[PDB]
Amino acid sequence: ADTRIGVTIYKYDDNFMSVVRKAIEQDAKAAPDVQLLMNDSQNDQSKQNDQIDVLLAKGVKALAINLVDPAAAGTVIEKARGQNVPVVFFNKEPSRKALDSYDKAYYVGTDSKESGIIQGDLIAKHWAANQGWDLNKDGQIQFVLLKGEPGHPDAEARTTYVIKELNDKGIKTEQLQLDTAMWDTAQAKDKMDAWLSGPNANKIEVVIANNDAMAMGAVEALKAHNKSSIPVFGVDALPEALALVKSGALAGTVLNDANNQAKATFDLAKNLADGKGAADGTNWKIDNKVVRVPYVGVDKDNLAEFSKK
Ligand SMILES: OC[C@H]1O[C@@H](O)[C@H](O)[C@@H](O)[C@@H]1O
Ligand SMILES: [Ca+2]
Structure with missing residues (x-):
């Protein structure tokens, strides 16, 4: 029964x-x-x-x-x-x-780390194909990273392995900003907005987000500042995100x-x-x-x- x-x-x-x-x-x-x-x-x-x-x-x-x-x-x-x-x-x-x-x-x-490694490979792939992304031509990725909840296995592994993967692939990275946006679109949009309104606004070359919801808040903030030429990477492949990949607003994501x-x-x-x-x-x-x-x-x-x- x-x-x-x-x-x-x-x-x-x-x-x-x-x-x-x-x-x-x-x-x-x-x-x-x-x-x-x-x-x-x-x-x-x-x-x-x-x-x-x-x-x-x-x-x-x-x-x-x-x-x-x-x-x-x-x-x-x-x-x-x-x-x-x-x-x-x-x-x-x-x-x-x-x-x-x-x-x-x-x-x-x-396997949380696997999502970090796949995202790092996607960035490495797109960076190599877009040498125009190296804005200061120092051969290094000047990035910002929107983290999910601290202590969350996915947030800690994705954050550590996206960078390790790039570094392992021979690509040097420089962390400009790193903050949590607790997996939320609205908080990510406010964090990205602050970052685009401060002193490193012009040094940012790539935006890395632990998930698509945070990546979508970053996209909105970039759009608002006419900085739509900066690539954004997420994780999840939500249907809303796939549309942004089609559009070119998202450079890559990972199917969760x-x-x-x-x-x-x-x-x-x-x-x-x-x-x-x-x-x-x-x-x-x-x-x-x-x-x-x-x-x-x-x-x-x-x-x-x-x-x-
Ligand atoms: O626990 C919830 C979180 O799980 C992660 O696996 C997902 O990628 C995030 O989008 C989500 O916010
Ligand atoms: Ca650079």
Whole structure:
């Protein structure tokens, strides 16, 4: 009969998680026996903590949790432990030690560093093809970087590896500005705006963003200052972003596969809810209770395979 699965999204207006949320709900439409209890945590772990308590009180058979704070996985795990309910963490990765503390805790996401490395290769590729981008002709990339949430695995890996990758490829970089915009378009637009209104405004050659939402706020700020000739790189390949790649407003992005992360999250939760063993009847490859879905770089050269088809 009706299996109840509780789901928490850290914040429903996060652009990426909005795609993932809708894919989980679509996926559930095809499981007649499952009932999903979806909750918006409104970007507050305290709110999310209360929500989990309510779900557990309502008898859910499994939890699929998108943590507000990755550091709170131990807290959620003790709550789930109390009812011996399985928990599938997704998109914000908990510590390995957290994961190991409970037999029924699983994680569905990505190899974060890989997105950093792919983005670094895309920049390296476009920089080599656009020697016009080296505004001060010093052979170095004068960049600014819009960071996601500090402490978020994706934000820390993307920030470290985009630069390491460029440097490894023999391209010297000079960090002009680095600040977090917490994955949000409006905050990124305000940060970029301040940067274009200060002393290095003219030294900036490339804008690197940890995600497409932040990259879109940078694009708007560049447009506002008639600096649309400065390239912007993001991560996610949101449909809104693909349009900017087509336009030339975005130089490149990286597909964060929401459809397969949604499907893996739903399959595992359902299987666990059913007392079945996480990958039963699926082709998902679990490696020490983790499922990682690959990233794919996207630019004008391969757009036609991501874009509208
Ligand atoms: O946790 C939410 C964040 O996840 C990252 O994987 C996504 O690339 C960001 O767009 C999103 O804001
Ligand atoms: Ca330069």
